[PDB]
Design a protein around this ligand. Structure first.
Ligand SMILES: CO[C@@H](Cc1ccc(OCCc2nc(-c3ccccc3)oc2C)c2ccsc12)C(=O)O
Lengths: 10, 258
């Protein structure tokens, strides 16, 4: 959830 | 080829410096007073603590301070993981899984960097909270700190520096045995290569340290027990402090963890 957004931010 | 392993080591170390503002080198410098204009405020009692706020009850306030520190750490560790070769090409769900299970192990690993037998640095190194003070905290919070110091003193005796830590951290993140991983093989393949870079790094950086590599691997397993002990203390708190709750990011990392 939050992990996903952190993992895909550039 | 060894040249490649040194380039991997170097890229990991550079990525580490970009992801973690406060390194172990800078922390030991502060702890030993070998830094320029800046000795940290020392928190050792209720009063000391209160003084710090400028520069609920005691135990709860320190607990949540550890939480904000932790949510910050997750973000730094996540950025570092995105710089490990091959990591971003893994199934996004396995990336989440690797992170969910690996993040606190790295937090404790790195937390040792800001600890000596007498206390731990807080808030980017502007403070130093004594070990004796943390031990005076009302149950069950006091036993949250001691086992971390116990691991840290022994971990630090191994004298790993930042360049060592960078590969060590990377090997931990890339564990193919995490629960619920969809594609084990490619994770183990990247880890095998990381392990070869770590072994070479430890041999070149600590040529006289007997069996350092094996000792380090053992610590990786020890970190798991540390987490286990921690989660069970958090279970207590969740159960006996029913009005308390963890920060959102931590709640998401902890749910359905093992
Ligand atoms: C609540 O535990 C956290 C992990 C964690 C994160 C950070 C942790 O401590 C080191 C830093 C530290 N910072 C503080 C602090 C206190 C007041 C205001 C701001 C900060 O206290 C400590 C011991 C520790 C120590 C034991 S556990 C832990 C978690 O479960 O995510």
């Amino acid at each position: 959830h939050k992990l996903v957004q952190l993992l895909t931010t550039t | 080829e060894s040249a490649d392993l040194r380039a991997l080591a170097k890229h990991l170390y550079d990525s580490y410096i970009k992801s973690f503002p406060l390194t172990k080198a800078k922390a030991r410098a502060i702890l030993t007073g070998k830094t320029t204009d800046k000795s940290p405020f020392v928190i050792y009692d209720m009063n000391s603590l209160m003084m710090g706020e400028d520069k609920k009850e005691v135990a709860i306030r320190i607990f949540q301070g550890c939480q904000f520190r932790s949510v910050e750490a997750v973000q730094e560790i996540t950025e570092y993981a995105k710089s490990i070769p091959g990591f971003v090409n893994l199934d996004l769900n396995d990336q989440v899984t690797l992170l969910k299970y690996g993040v606190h192990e790295i937090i404790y690993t790195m937390l040792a960097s800001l600890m000596n037998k007498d206390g731990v640095l807080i808030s980017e190194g502007q403070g130093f909270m004594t070990r004796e003070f943390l031990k005076s905290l009302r149950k069950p919070f006091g036993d949250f700190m001691e086992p971390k110091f116990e691991f840290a003193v022994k971990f630090n005796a191994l004298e790993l520096d930042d360049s060592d830590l960078a590969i060590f951290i990377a090997v931990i993140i890339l564990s193919g045995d995490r629960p619920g991983l969809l594609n084990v093989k490619p994770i183990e393949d990247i880890q095998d290569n990381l392990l070869q870079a770590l072994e070479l790094q430890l041999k070149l950086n600590h040529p006289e340290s007997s069996q350092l590599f094996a000792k380090l691997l053992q610590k990786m397993t020890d970190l798991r027990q540390i987490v286990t002990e921690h989660v069970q203390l958090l279970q207590v708190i969740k159960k006996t402090e029913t009005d308390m709750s963890l920060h959102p990011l931590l709640q998401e990392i902890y749910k359905d963890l093992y």
